[PDB]
Structures are given as C-alpha cells and as structure tokens.
Design a protein around this motif. Structure first.
Motif, PDB file in Angstrom:
ATOM      1  N   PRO A   1       0.821  -1.222   0.000  1.00 47.17           N
ATOM      2  CA  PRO A   1       0.000   0.000   0.000  1.00 47.17           C
ATOM      3  C   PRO A   1       0.855   1.271   0.000  1.00 47.17           C
ATOM      4  O   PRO A   1       1.988   1.246   0.472  1.00 47.17           O
ATOM      5  N   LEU A   2       0.317   2.381  -0.509  1.00 49.24           N
ATOM      6  CA  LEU A   2       0.992   3.675  -0.597  1.00 49.24           C
ATOM      7  C   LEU A   2      -0.013   4.820  -0.753  1.00 49.24           C
ATOM      8  O   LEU A   2      -0.957   4.743  -1.545  1.00 49.24           O
ATOM      9  N   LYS A   3       0.184   5.882   0.029  1.00 46.62           N
ATOM     10  CA  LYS A   3      -0.799   6.954   0.228  1.00 46.62           C
ATOM     11  C   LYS A   3      -0.160   8.354   0.242  1.00 46.62           C
ATOM     12  O   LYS A   3       1.023   8.506   0.569  1.00 46.62           O
ATOM     13  N   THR A   4      -0.949   9.368  -0.127  1.00 46.91           N
ATOM     14  CA  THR A   4      -0.569  10.789  -0.152  1.00 46.91           C
ATOM     15  C   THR A   4      -0.335  11.339   1.256  1.00 46.91           C
ATOM     16  O   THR A   4      -0.870  10.825   2.236  1.00 46.91           O
ATOM     17  N   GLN A   5       0.442  12.412   1.340  1.00 47.52           N
ATOM     18  CA  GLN A   5       0.780  13.164   2.543  1.00 47.52           C
ATOM     19  C   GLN A   5       1.229  14.553   2.076  1.00 47.52           C
ATOM     20  O   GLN A   5       1.870  14.660   1.024  1.00 47.52           O
ATOM     21  N   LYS A  29      13.704   5.042  -2.808  1.00 50.31           N
ATOM     22  CA  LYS A  29      12.911   3.811  -2.646  1.00 50.31           C
ATOM     23  C   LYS A  29      11.647   4.081  -1.797  1.00 50.31           C
ATOM     24  O   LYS A  29      11.701   4.893  -0.869  1.00 50.31           O
ATOM     25  N   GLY A  30      10.522   3.413  -2.091  1.00 55.12           N
ATOM     26  CA  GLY A  30       9.267   3.493  -1.326  1.00 55.12           C
ATOM     27  C   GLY A  30       8.286   4.604  -1.733  1.00 55.12           C
ATOM     28  O   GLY A  30       7.337   4.829  -0.988  1.00 55.12           O
ATOM     29  N   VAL A  31       8.481   5.282  -2.871  1.00 54.42           N
ATOM     30  CA  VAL A  31       7.597   6.363  -3.382  1.00 54.42           C
ATOM     31  C   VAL A  31       6.890   5.976  -4.693  1.00 54.42           C
ATOM     32  O   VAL A  31       7.218   4.957  -5.310  1.00 54.42           O
ATOM     33  N   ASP A  48       4.898   4.586   0.602  1.00 52.35           N
ATOM     34  CA  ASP A  48       4.510   3.326   1.226  1.00 52.35           C
ATOM     35  C   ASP A  48       4.804   3.417   2.733  1.00 52.35           C
ATOM     36  O   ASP A  48       5.982   3.388   3.113  1.00 52.35           O
ATOM     37  N   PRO A  49       3.775   3.534   3.600  1.00 50.61           N
ATOM     38  CA  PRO A  49       3.945   3.829   5.022  1.00 50.61           C
ATOM     39  C   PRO A  49       4.541   2.655   5.818  1.00 50.61           C
ATOM     40  O   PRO A  49       4.659   2.749   7.041  1.00 50.61           O
ATOM     41  N   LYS A  50       4.925   1.564   5.142  1.00 46.62           N
ATOM     42  CA  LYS A  50       5.550   0.383   5.756  1.00 46.62           C
ATOM     43  C   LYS A  50       6.972   0.161   5.244  1.00 46.62           C
ATOM     44  O   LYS A  50       7.858  -0.124   6.049  1.00 46.62           O
TER      45      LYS A  50
END
Length: 71
Positions: A1-5, A29-31, A48-50
């Motif tokens: 999963p991956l979300k806006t901030q 990495k992770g964007v 990705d918050p993980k």
C-alpha cells in the motif's frame, strides 16, 4: 500500500529551490508520486507507510537547508 501526505516547509517558497527537493524523488525507494508548490512554499508526496515514513522526506529537507512541518 501507498498513500498521499502533504506538509509545510520552512524556506522552499519564492525560488527554484523546490527542484533540489523534487529532483531526488525519482531516485528514492518506497515512493510513487509527488508535487511542489513554490507559490505558497508547500509539498505533497505519495509513499509506502511500511517500506518508509516521513523520514523519506525529512532528511531531504533538513540537509538541503530547510525544515519539515507535518502536523
């Protein structure tokens, strides 16, 4: 999963300096997505918050000469 901030940033406004933050995006990495606003001096980022956290945008602001605010 991956979300806006989205966040305020001390001193990114009114100049091309946002490009020292947003050029690095595509190397991280992770964007998956991000977008500066120089007019107001703020940022949005999708991550990705993980795999990662606010740490995938904090160091890239704090070492570039500015400060992050995500309240």
């Amino acid at each position: 999963p991956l979300k806006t901030q989205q966040m305020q940033v001390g001193g990114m406004r009114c100049a091309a300096c946002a490009s020292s933050i947003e050029r690095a995006l595509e190397r991280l990495k992770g964007v998956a997505e991000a977008s500066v606003t120089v007019a107001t001096g703020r940022l949005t980022v999708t991550y990705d918050p993980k795999q990662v956290s606010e740490i995938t945008i904090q160091e890239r602001i704090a070492a570039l000469g500015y400060t992050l605010a995500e309240p």
